Design a protein around this ligand. Sequence first.
Ligand SMILES: [Yb+3]
Length: 658
Amino acid sequence: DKTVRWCAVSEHEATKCQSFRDHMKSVIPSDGPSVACVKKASYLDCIRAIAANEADAVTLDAGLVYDAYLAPNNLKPVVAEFYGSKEDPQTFYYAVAVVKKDSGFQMNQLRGKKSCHTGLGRSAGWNIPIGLLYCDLPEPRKPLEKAVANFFSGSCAPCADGTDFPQLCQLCPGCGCSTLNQYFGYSGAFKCLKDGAGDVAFVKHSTIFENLANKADRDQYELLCLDNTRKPVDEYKDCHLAQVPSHTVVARSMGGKEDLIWELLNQAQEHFGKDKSKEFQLFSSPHGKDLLFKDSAHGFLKVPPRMDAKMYLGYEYVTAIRNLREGTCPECKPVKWCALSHHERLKCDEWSVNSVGKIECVSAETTEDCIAKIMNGEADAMSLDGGFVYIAGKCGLVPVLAENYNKPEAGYFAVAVVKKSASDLTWDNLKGKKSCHTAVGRTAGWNIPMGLLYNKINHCRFDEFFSEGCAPGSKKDSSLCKLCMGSGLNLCEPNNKEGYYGYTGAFRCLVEKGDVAFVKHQTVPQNTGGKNPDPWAKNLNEKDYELLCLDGTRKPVEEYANCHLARAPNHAVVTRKDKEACVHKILRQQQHLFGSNFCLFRSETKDLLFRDDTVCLAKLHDRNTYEKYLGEEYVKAVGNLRKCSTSSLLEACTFRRP
Ligand SMILES: [Yb+3]
C-alpha cells in the first residue's frame, strides 16, 4: 500500500477525513495513494503518533510546527497551504511593529512606551514581540504579564489580568477580551495606535492596508525593524519581527513519506479543491469549520526539500518562541566560524585556541550547509565567493567585511583563457566549443562569463551552446559534465574530489581537454613555469596561453588588466544582521593580531577559511547588502542565470521570499 495516515484531532475532523478517504478512491487509480484516518486527542498527540510511525501527516500552526521539530519528534514541513490566489499565493504572514512617523524611537527603545496588542496569547500581537523582548524584560520575568507590565509604561493587552497588573489595561480598561473592546483584534490594536492611545501596535503586515485605504494616511506610519531602524509600512518584507507560515503539513524527517503526501494532496486539490464543485469539498464541511485544513485555503504548495523547520519558521520566529519556551537569558560572545573540511576545521581549531575562546568552530559538509547554519544561528560567520554571497543574501544574510588583495578594492579579474595554438577562438564566437568552469554559480567560473554570454543568446541552456565541458555542480547527465575527471560519485561534484573543480581545476581542464577556461587573472601565472609541480602543470609555459578580450581579439596572459571579461567582487565574510557589529569588531581585533607578518591569511593546504592572497579584511561602508556589494549588473546577470541553475538552498530561501 501507498497509504497516507492522516492525523485528525477531533471527531468532526475524523469524519471529514473518512469522507476524504472514500472520495479519493473514486479518482485515484489503485497503484496511486490512499488515505487512512487516525484520530487523536490533540495536535501534540498527533505529533507523537507521526513520530512513532503510527501516523504520517498532520497540518499545523507555526508554534506547533516548532514543537514538532523538537526532539524526540523531529518532524518537518512538507506541504504548505496557500491563501489569496493561484497567481499570487500567500503562504506566510509577517508580524510587524507599527509606529507613528516621527515618534522618534526604535525597537531597542520600547521600554517605557505605551503598547497596543491584539490580544494576550496571540502570535503577532503578543507571543512574538514579547518573545523577542523577553531578555529586555525586568527580573523576575515570571509571571510574564507582570514583567511586561513593568516594561511598557501602560498598554492595551486584551485578556490580560488587569486586576493584578492594571498597567496592561490602562489604554483599554478591563482588558476586554472581545470585540466589545474597541482595541481588540488586529484592527483593534491598530486603532489603539491610530487614535493616539499608544505608541506602538503589534500586528500583521496587512492590518494597516485593511484599515487605511489612502497612501497619504499610511505615510504617517512606519515599522520598527530589528536592526533598530525604521521603514515604510509597505516594506514589511525587509522590516518585520517574524515571518510566520499560516498552515503547514508536517511529516517525519526520515521515512517521510513526503513524496506520497504531496501526490495525495496535489490530486485532492485537482479534483476537490477550490471551485471544483463536487459534493465533497476539500476546504469545507457540513461537519464544521477549518477541519484538517483552513476553509480559507486555495490550495497546496510543495515545500522545497532542503527545508527543515528552523529554516521554514525563520531565525526571528524561532528566537521569539525559544525565549518563551526556555526562558533563558545571558549576562559580545564567541564568534562561531563555519569550516567546510578537515583541513579547514584544523586551522579553525588552532585559530580558536589562539584567540582565547573569542572564536569557536562549527563545521558542515558543504557551503550551503554552512550558510544554513549561519541563517539559523548554529554558526555565525564564514568567507564566501561572490556567488555564495548572492545566495547568502537571498537567504537574509549580509556581508560585513571584504577580503583585500592589493595594498576598499574594485576587485579581482575574470578572464577567459585559451591555448595559443588554437588561434581561431575569439570571445565573439565560442559556439560549439568545449568549456571549463570552476563551478556553476561561482563568480569567475560562471556568473560573469555566462552572464555576458546570456546577453548574446538570451537563454541560459549552455549545455546546448557549448558542445561539451566540465562545470562542476551541473546535472551529472549534462554535456557539461563530460570533460570532468572525478570517478564514480565524485564525477562533476563541486568539491576537491573532482580534479577539474576550482580555479586551478578549470585551468587543468583547459590544458588536458578544453578549448576555454573561465578563471581569474592569477590562475595561469601560478600554475605554469614549474610553480605548480604536479605532472599536468609542471612543464607548461604561460606564453602558450592567451586571454580572450571582449572585442574579439586576444592577448598574452600577463596583459590581463586590458583583457578581462569583467571585474570581480572580492570574496567576502557574511553573517546575520544581529551579529554584524560583533563580527565587524572581533575580526578587526584578530587581524591586527594574526594578519600580515599562527598566521590567519596563510594556510597549510591552500586557500583555507580565507583566500591566501588576503592581506586585510576591509570595511564595506554603504555596501553592506548583497545587492550593494555585488552591484546591480552582477545581480541582474545572476537573476537571468537562476532560470536554468538549481541550488536547493536558493530554492528554499526564495520559497520564503520570492
Ligand atoms: Yb571567486
